[PDB]
Curated annotation (Swiss-Prot), chain A:
Protein name: Proteasome subunit beta type-6
Species this chain originates from: Saccharomyces cerevisiae (strain ATCC 204508 / S288c) (Baker's yeast)
Superkingdom assignment: Eukaryota
Encoding gene (name): PRE7
InterPro entries the record matches: Ntn_hydrolases_N, Proteasome_bsu_CS, Proteasome_sua/b, Proteasome_suB-type
Pfam families: Proteasome
Primary location: cytoplasm
Any single biological process term in GO: proteasome-mediated ubiquitin-dependent protein catabolic process
UniProt keywords, alphabetically: Cytoplasm, Nucleus, Proteasome
General function of this protein: Non-catalytic component of the proteasome which degrades poly-ubiquitinated proteins in the cytoplasm and in the nucleus. It is essential for the regulated turnover of proteins and for the removal of misfolded proteins. The proteasome is a multicatalytic proteinase complex that is characterized by its ability to cleave peptides with Arg, Phe, Tyr, Leu, and Glu adjacent to the leaving group at neutral or slightly basic pH. It has an ATP-dependent proteolytic activity.
UniProtKB/Swiss-Prot annotation, chain B:
Lineage: Eukaryota, Fungi, Dikarya, Ascomycota, Saccharomycotina
One Pfam family linked to the record: Proteasome
Similarity comment: family membership: Belongs to the peptidase T1A family.
PANTHER family per record: PROTEASOME SUBUNIT ALPHA/BETA (PTHR11599)
Chief place of localization: cytoplasm
Function: The proteasome degrades poly-ubiquitinated proteins in the cytoplasm and in the nucleus. It is essential for the regulated turnover of proteins and for the removal of misfolded proteins. The proteasome is a multicatalytic proteinase complex that is characterized by its ability to cleave peptides with Arg, Phe, Tyr, Leu, and Glu adjacent to the leaving group at neutral or slightly basic pH. It has an ATP-dependent proteolytic activity.
Protein name stated in the entry: Proteasome subunit alpha type-6
Modified residues (Phosphoserine): S13
Gene Ontology cellular component annotations, sorted alphabetically: nucleus; proteasome complex; proteasome core complex, alpha-subunit complex; proteasome storage granule
Subunit (UniProt): The 26S proteasome consists of a 20S proteasome core and two 19S regulatory subunits. The 20S proteasome core is composed of 28 subunits that are arranged in four stacked rings, resulting in a barrel-shaped structure. The two end rings are each formed by seven alpha subunits, and the two central rings are each formed by seven beta subunits. The catalytic chamber with the active sites is on the inside of the barrel.
Cross-link type Glycyl lysine isopeptide (Lys-Gly) (interchain with G-Cter in ubiquitin), residue numbers: K190
Listed SUPFAM superfamilies: N-terminal nucleophile aminohydrolases (Ntn hydrolases)
Subcellular location: Cytoplasm; Nucleus
From Swiss-Prot, chain C:
Keyword NAD: no
Organism: Saccharomyces cerevisiae (strain ATCC 204508 / S288c)
Protein family (similarity comment): Belongs to the peptidase T1A family.
NCBIfam families with a match to the protein in the record: PRK03996.1 (NF003075)
UniProt-recorded name of the protein: Proteasome subunit alpha type-5
Keyword set, alphabetical order: Cytoplasm, Nucleus, Phosphoprotein, Proteasome
Reported function: The proteasome degrades poly-ubiquitinated proteins in the cytoplasm and in the nucleus. It is essential for the regulated turnover of proteins and for the removal of misfolded proteins. The proteasome is a multicatalytic proteinase complex that is characterized by its ability to cleave peptides with Arg, Phe, Tyr, Leu, and Glu adjacent to the leaving group at neutral or slightly basic pH. It has an ATP-dependent proteolytic activity.
Gene label: PUP2
Species classification: Eukaryota, Fungi, Dikarya, Ascomycota, Saccharomycotina
Swiss-Prot record, chain E:
One Pfam family recorded for the sequence: Proteasome
Keyword Nucleus: yes
Alphabetic keyword roster: Cytoplasm, Nucleus, Phosphoprotein, Proteasome
Function as written in the Swiss-Prot or TrEMBL entry: The proteasome degrades poly-ubiquitinated proteins in the cytoplasm and in the nucleus. It is essential for the regulated turnover of proteins and for the removal of misfolded proteins. The proteasome is a multicatalytic proteinase complex that is characterized by its ability to cleave peptides with Arg, Phe, Tyr, Leu, and Glu adjacent to the leaving group at neutral or slightly basic pH. It has an ATP-dependent proteolytic activity.
CDD domains on file: proteasome_alpha_type_7
Organism of provenance: Saccharomyces cerevisiae (strain ATCC 204508 / S288c) (Baker's yeast)
Name of this chain's protein: Proteasome subunit alpha type-4
Complexes and interactors: The 26S proteasome consists of a 20S proteasome core and two 19S regulatory subunits. The 20S proteasome core is composed of 28 subunits that are arranged in four stacked rings, resulting in a barrel-shaped structure. The two end rings are each formed by seven alpha subunits, and the two central rings are each formed by seven beta subunits. The catalytic chamber with the active sites is on the inside of the barrel. Interacts with CIC1.
Gene (UniProt): PRE6
Amino acid sequence: QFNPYGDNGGTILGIAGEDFAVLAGDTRNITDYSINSRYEPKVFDCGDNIVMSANGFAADGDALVKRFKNSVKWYHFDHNDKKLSINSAARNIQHLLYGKRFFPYYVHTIIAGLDEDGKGAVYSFDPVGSYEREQCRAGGAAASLIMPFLDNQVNFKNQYEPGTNGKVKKPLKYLSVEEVIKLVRDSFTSATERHIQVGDGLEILIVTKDGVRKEFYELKRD
Amino acid sequence: FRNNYDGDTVTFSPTGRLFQVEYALEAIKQGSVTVGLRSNTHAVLVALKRNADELSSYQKKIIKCDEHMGLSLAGLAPDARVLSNYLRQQCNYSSLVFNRKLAVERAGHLLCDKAQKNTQSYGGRPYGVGLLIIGYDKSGAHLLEFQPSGNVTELYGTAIGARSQGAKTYLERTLDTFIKIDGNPDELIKAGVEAISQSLRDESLTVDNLSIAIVGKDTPFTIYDGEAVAKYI
Amino acid sequence: DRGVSTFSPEGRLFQVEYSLEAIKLGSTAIGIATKEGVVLGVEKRATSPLLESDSIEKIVEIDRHIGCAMSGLTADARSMIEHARTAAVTHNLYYDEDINVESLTQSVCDLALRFGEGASGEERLMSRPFGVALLIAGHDADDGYQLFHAEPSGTFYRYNAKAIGSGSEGAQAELLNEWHSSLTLKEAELLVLKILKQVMEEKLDENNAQLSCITKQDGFKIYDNEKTAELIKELKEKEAAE
Amino acid sequence: TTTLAFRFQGGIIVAVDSRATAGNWVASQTVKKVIEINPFLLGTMAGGAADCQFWETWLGSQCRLHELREKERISVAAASKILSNLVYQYKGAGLSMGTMICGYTRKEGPTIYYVDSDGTRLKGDIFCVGSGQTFAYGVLDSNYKWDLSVEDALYLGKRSILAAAHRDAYSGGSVNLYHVTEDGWIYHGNHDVGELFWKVKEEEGSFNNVIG
Amino acid sequence: GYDRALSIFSPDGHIFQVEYALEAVKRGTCAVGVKGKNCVVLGCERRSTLKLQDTRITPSKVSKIDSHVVLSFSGLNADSRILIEKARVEAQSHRLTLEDPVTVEYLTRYVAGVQQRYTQSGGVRPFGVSTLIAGFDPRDDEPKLYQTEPSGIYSSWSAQTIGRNSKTVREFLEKNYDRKEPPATVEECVKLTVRSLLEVVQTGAKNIEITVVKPDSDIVALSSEEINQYVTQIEQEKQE
Amino acid sequence: DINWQELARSTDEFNGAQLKAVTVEAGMIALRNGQSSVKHEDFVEGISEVQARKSKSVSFYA
């Protein structure tokens, strides 16, 4: 009996700062312990400074993107080139996954971008359909592996000020762009060791008002 | 010959010329003037944006169809619409399925056919609107004319609608000059302005009315107005 | 026949010519757009005192940020109104984004820019030729306040001020020069009443005319008959001085 | 999940958590389980999150069309029934919805209709839907009266979630308090349950089962 | 002319079939509605001059659509049978899906929608019935009066008359009723409707049918002796 | 500037007398204008008075 839905591993990570947002991911593509493809990108530009990866079952994600590209074309044509909103894209994506609800799509999707305010913003989709605005959200099977680090290095959750021992919580502190890229590298480097999904390359597309920057780093192959 | 034969598409005159066809052509003559031309590397359409009165905004008659495609209308407004959305559809199918941008020529053969179906049919409308379509494929720049007949013809330069006489003459003369000119967006765009002045009874030369489109091997399909067309005006 | 399969000898289509007359005979409606709101006035054409005038309305809230007045055929106008409401609600569900006025004008006109029974690569739901225009007024963020003249005929035209119906030739002549962009919302209301006063044979009162505005702040806001009435009083007053 | 609702003289207090678990792990603690169908109605995401979201986004449209046509405020009854019909007919589509439509009209007064994926529509004074409903009910019932003061109802709503949150595994997040007044719902802040636990601990001498 | 087409929009702007509908309304019985502050009185002609007619099983012109929604009509009896049936079904539909009892105002629109639809769809005649739909809104005790026309639109008037010799009735309605004040008492209101109907019936106990509809599902049709009592009192005034 | 070819392509079934009607009309515009010169433009307009239709009949789009 044919396999209803594949898995192609991978881990992605969308982080909402206050002036940038990154969408990170490995390039390692797998089925079982064989590397299907050592290099194969997954973060895709959708335009107007909105990035997208539909991580998990690769085939479902290719379909999802493929249709969304077409919709971007008809959104601009009828609305006199209104800049396709982040939220508008999100509602659109929800509606593709809810499209077959009976045999739901098997993709854990993250779109990142800027909201209209201008803060970095991340929206995250669970496959069941639902979506919500999020601060930091990793996706995939190692979503749970990565998240505690971020909730103890930036969110400062469960950190308190030295010497109070809990009276006064240690307040949020905004980080530069650079500072976040290092953090993203270290998380992924640790996961190369501790998980076989992450490796080959760490390709990060960063979306600002200033345009799109591309950042690349190699990860090991062991 | 009102009613009787030639009164409906099916019925033939003895000779077999539909009188209606000539009327559909007349709709183009009543239509907004537009001049199209090319060079190997660029295709430039100039169209006068008609308006009702001062307060009514100068209305675009150049429509971007796709990133690398666009068209201009002269003739009946409802017909142009049903056809334009179809242009868009076909281009999307090929890009998705077969990878490729829809070639300009090959899209035209389909467009011909669509016009002939309404001529076979009891009832329906043969499309009564003529379209100058420009495009950038892997064969480079093209310019077609779509007729109410259906026929698509690759022409160096042509003009349709109101007082075509002055710009057609102008194109014949400067034929050799704009076809040699390549690698110069700005000069093609100049040739085209100069051309539309001849057709007009000097109705307007305003930046506000002329709208210029260009798609080629260099520029994507971009609509130019106000200041960008003030360079060349 | 004289359908749309028949191409007029003229280069036209016979139905398209036939549609215009229905707008000409229609109710008199005035809109003047400012950058502080658009004000639309209509004659409710009260005919008897047993007619309940208030009940009847030819200015109708279409959507949160958009309203329409109607000129043409009263019959066609039902269907047209239902189409428009639906068109707006579908996009809001689908993308949950406030739409432009521009986006709305187009979509209404989408059903309009086809006539006949024959279809060839499309659906039909029509069974005629419709002949009803609207004044489509609103606000979008992008381009601010916009006023459109939606036509059942050629492509939609944007307007800064427009008057249609049976009072049209006079009303419009007055508008070309009386229009300006420097008007306040208060200046502009009185100017709409002024034109209305001239082209309506019977004297102006609040039982046969109603004013409304779209300002983003108060949404589509129908004037109180008290609010309307006072400004009529104000109108007569300044004309006495003048 | 724990979500609860009670009607009283002053209207309705609706209080929800924010936790949402996927598998054994906490996926999120920020999913707001208040869906503003429109300014008049509050719907809850309880039950199937996605199904609830999708079909109340739908419900927004039906309310809007009604309001346009008859130009008066929709009964809570009319909107919940419209939802009920849609969901019965499609059942056997992995639907799992469970929602309380909360609204305060004078047409009917405070009105709560619990709608369910089966297609059941049940009226009540007090409903509590959730995994942790069961905890919530103990504190809720004993301070529940119709003639309970407004001021006391605000406290009650926070306390009811505090309790559920503590015992249930699938509940934590934060408290969103909402009051469904005559004119519509009003938001009464976000208050972290984590923090509230300590204040309450100190203040009553409660939370004595708990070490120390 | 253009009477053979509906699709054809007509440069006259007026499709003849539509004009012809009006001819048909005129011919029918006179049906009148006059509303108080707490009542709708519907006075209507029902002919009964027919020899060898068993009056019991002959359908009364007034037909209960709903429990508190009533209809009187002028124009062809056959064509009118379709509106009554669609409207009855929709009545019960409303309750089935909104729970809410029939909104009268929805119902006015629903009915007009049908006379409209058929103007656009070729091969379906526009109906040559005009109706009075009268009722009382959910959770309300203010009387509600509507007329529909075969032009596919609707309107509300304070009081209105349709059918044969409506010209005569309209003068009465202007001078004895007012929009500003309807007759506050039910009683006042009923007596004037009898005097209006007398102008075209010219004396008949069963030729005049009075149905008073009150709020909260109160439908009662006036007793023949009471109707007779309105007539005699009025007739004394006529020679003074 | 007269292009005999362009005029002839748009005309269909105009006998000799019809044709002279066209010619006179193009020149009549030019008489009002004051130029002894007749322009090709005058002529293309001048066909449509000799046609059943009045010259350049108004149209909704343009």
